[PDB]
Design a protein around this nucleic acid. Structure first.
Ligand code: 118
Lengths: 465, 50, 49, 90
DNA sequence: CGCCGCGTCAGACTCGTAGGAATCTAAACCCTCCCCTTAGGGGAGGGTCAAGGC
DNA sequence: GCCTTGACCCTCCCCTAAGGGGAGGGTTTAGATTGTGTGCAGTCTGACGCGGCG
């Protein structure tokens, strides 16, 4: 396309959308709102396996009268306890049921945007619906291994009848030998189908009404999603016009844009058109919040917490005006007196605001000598020290041979020489069954002999450290 | 080290909390001192020589 | 202040003075250079210049 | 009412309210499940008045607790009247 | 087939010195965890000081 | 000489009542505002290989 720049590639794919007018955003928000309540409608007459609000009003048990908070919850359930008495009559799809449960929907429409409370009721069937799905997958991974059979008669009448296994009698009807080529495995089909039939027991309702109105419940959750998408896609110029005042502060342009878009996606989710204000006035807050939060979390090699960021910024703002006013830079005393903090903290803050230098920094007249060439390894031992360590080990091994073997084993155990660990008196006397005190006696013996001048001046040579 | 621990046990000497970081003349150089200057921070005790 | 002190302290034409002689300084203050910002590069100058 | 406004109704610090909740002396009315915020009501103030009234006589926290929830237990008060009568002498 | 445009790769060795490293705005509220405050108590684990039994 | 007592002693960690001070982390904020910007860098010559168009 004759270009490889991704900022132009973005600003080009972003310009194929039109800006909205004051009525466009209102009637987009209206359908965003009514799809999410069409869903809440569809959740209404699902069986008691849902987490329905019977005692959610009691689970929790603008400051509204307690008598108002206790009473208006009695309207809905006062009609609901008598309404779904008709769950039995004429199957599961009775028309009085649709009429009065969409009258419960007439009641339901009153409400508007809410936290994940509503979410946790539709999840009430998530954990239950896909379950059903996956179980009828199991039957299939138990049929295809043994026999091959055309799927569009079987699964079609599977969708249709759901009364009993009598639809398998529709498999032999065409009189081809693939009818009962299956042998000794159909009880596994009956296994999984029977377990989902006891799932049907706990639900009490057949699958082709639950999935039937889930087909229309999925219409609301998609029709809200699509309107949210085209409410987001029409406002990207706002993000791009805000995020151009945060440049040269540690992030690149497209990073700031992709941080602003995640805030716009929340301003779209929290909007309320009834309050009468435009969309820009509410969205700018979330856009700026996202960009500001990402500048303080990224964009430093060594990360500083947010409270220290605000302290640094405040001290910069004070020193600017004191420099404009005095004509000089103020000493930390003149900053402590006005910032009203203890001077040691003002001295502590002033060290934390420096970014590490690159190891490729050219140092000299040329550019073949770098800063990283003159950096020395500090954790190495000098060879004079290695030789000294080995010579001292040999000298000690020679002096430890003069005195008794049993009387040197105790020194080896007591100072840990040639062993994996140091030991204590009682655990050494464990193997000697000698008293707590005799060990100390023989140690004061050995250490008294070992400094007699017939022996000491070979080891004394080392202690000039 | 264990061996150096036994050395300290025998001859009784102990080290201390501070290390020597003094400024020295580099090798090969031999000169006469002609000037000294001391710069100390505001809020620090000035010393006899300063 | 940043733009001024960066020029006076880290430029390529701002140089540590040569101070062996009187003549060393007189000569350092009269030198003319073709390198620097807006000038040639050592590797990419030809024979004719 | 949130903790910051209730702290100005009673003229007491916030760390004091946190401590009293930890001890079990003054428990808020409602605590947010996910945030953890504390909300108070007027009867909390009627009880804080009693707490301060008891605290003005020199009792420590355990006896104030034992005094508020439990039976009258009059033997603790006069027993305090000796610890003051002695203390003055000292 | 042939010419031209355009993109990629290369350009001697060893020594010296030379201080510091360059713009750049959020504010109110809540929570939990960690250490601090007097003047000593209490224990755990590991050492030391005379005295004899043999 | 080769062991057993009964005293003594030391350092290190955790504890007391009623909060105080701070570090480091979470959340929202409703008049409107709808496409970058540096007062850029662009700056060498020679040989070679491949694609795109006549
Ligand atoms: C410079 C420019 C804007 C703000 Sb603000 C703001 C700050 C304090 C009190 C009220 C408003 C802001 C908002 C969210 C995140 C970061 C900063 C602000 C917001 C919208 C419109 C105009 C200004 C601050 C400094």
């Amino acid at each position: 396309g004759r270009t490889t720049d991704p900022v132009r590639m973005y600003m080009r794919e972003m310009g194929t959308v039109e800006l909205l007018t004051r009525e466009g955003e209102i009637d987009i928000a209206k359908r965003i709102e009514d799809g999410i309540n069409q869903v809440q409608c569809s959740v209404a007459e699902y069986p008691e396996a849902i987490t329905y609000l019977l005692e959610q009003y009691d689970r929790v048990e603008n400051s509204i009268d307690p008598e108002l908070a206790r009473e208006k919850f009695a309207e809905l359930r006062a009609q609901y306890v008598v309404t779904r008495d008709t769950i039995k009559a004429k199957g599961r799809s009775h028309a009085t049921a649709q009429e009065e449960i969409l009258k419960l929907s007439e009641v339901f429409k009153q409400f508007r945007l809410v936290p994940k409370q509503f979410d946790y009721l539709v999840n009430s069937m998530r954990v239950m619906m896909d379950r059903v799905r996956t179980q009828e997958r199991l039957i299939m991974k138990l049929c295809v291994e043994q026999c091959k059979m055309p799927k569009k008669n079987f699964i079609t009448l599977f969708t249709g009848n759901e009364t009993s296994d009598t639809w398998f009698n529709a498999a032999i009807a065409m009189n081809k030998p693939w009818s009962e080529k299956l042998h000794d495995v159909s009880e596994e089909v009956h296994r999984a189908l029977q377990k989902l039939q006891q799932i049907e027991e706990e639900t009490g309702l057949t699958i082709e009404q639950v999935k039937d109105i889930n087909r229309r419940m999925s219409i609301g959750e998609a029709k809200a999603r699509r309107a949210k998408k085209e409410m987001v896609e029409a406002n990207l110029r706002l993000v791009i016009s805000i995020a151009k005042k945060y440049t040269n502060r540690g992030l690149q342009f497209l990073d700031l844009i992709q941080e602003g878009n995640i805030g716009l996606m929340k301003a779209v989710d929290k909007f309320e058109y009834r309050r009468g204000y435009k969309f820009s006035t509410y969205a700018t807050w979330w856009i700026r919040q996202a960009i500001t939060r990402s500048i303080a979390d990224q964009a430093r090699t060594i990360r500083i917490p947010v409270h220290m960021i605000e302290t640094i910024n405040k001290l910069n703002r004070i020193s600017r005006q004191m420099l404009q006013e005095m004509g000089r830079e103020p000493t930390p005393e003149e900053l402590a007196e006005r910032m009203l903090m203890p001077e040691d903290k003002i001295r502590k803050v002033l060290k934390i605001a420096k970014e590490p230098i690159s190891m490729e920094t050219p140092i000299g007249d040329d550019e073949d000598s770098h800063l990283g060439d003159f950096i020395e390894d500090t954790t190495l031992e000098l060879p004079l020290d290695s030789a000294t360590t080995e010579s001292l080990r040999a000298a000690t091994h020679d002096v430890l041979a003069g005195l008794t073997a049993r009387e040197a084993k105790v020194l080896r155990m007591r100072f840990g020489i040639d062993m994996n660990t140091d030991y204590t008196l009682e655990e050494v006397g464990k193997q000697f069954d000698v008293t707590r005190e005799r060990i100390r006696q023989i140690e004061a013996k050995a250490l008294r002999k070992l400094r007699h001048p017939s022996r000491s001046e070979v080891l004394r040579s080392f202690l000039d450290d | 080290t264990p061996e150096e621990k036994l050395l300290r046990a025998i001859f009784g000497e102990k080290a201390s909390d501070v290390k020597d970081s003094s400024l020295r003349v580099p090798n090969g150089v031999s000169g006469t001192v002609i000037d000294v200057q001391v710069f100390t921070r505001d809020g620090v005790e000035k010393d006899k020589r300063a | 202040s940043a733009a001024v002190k960066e020029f006076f302290g880290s430029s390529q034409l701002s140089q540590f003075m040569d101070q062996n002689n009187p003549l060393s300084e007189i000569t350092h203050k009269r030198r003319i250079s073709a390198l620097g910002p807006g000038g040639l590069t050592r590797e990419r100058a030809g024979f004719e210049v | 009412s949130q903790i910051g406004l209730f702290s100005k109704i009673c003229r007491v610090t916030i760390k004091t309210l946190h401590y009293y909740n930890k001890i079990g002396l003054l428990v808020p009315a409602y605590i947010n499940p996910d945030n953890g915020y504390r909300f108070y009501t007027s009867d909390q103030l009627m009880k804080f008045h009693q707490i301060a009234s008891l605290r003005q006589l020199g009792f420590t926290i355990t006896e104030i607790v034992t005094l508020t929830q439990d039976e009258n237990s009059c033997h603790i008060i006069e027993r305090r009247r000796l610890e003051i009568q002695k203390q003055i002498r000292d």
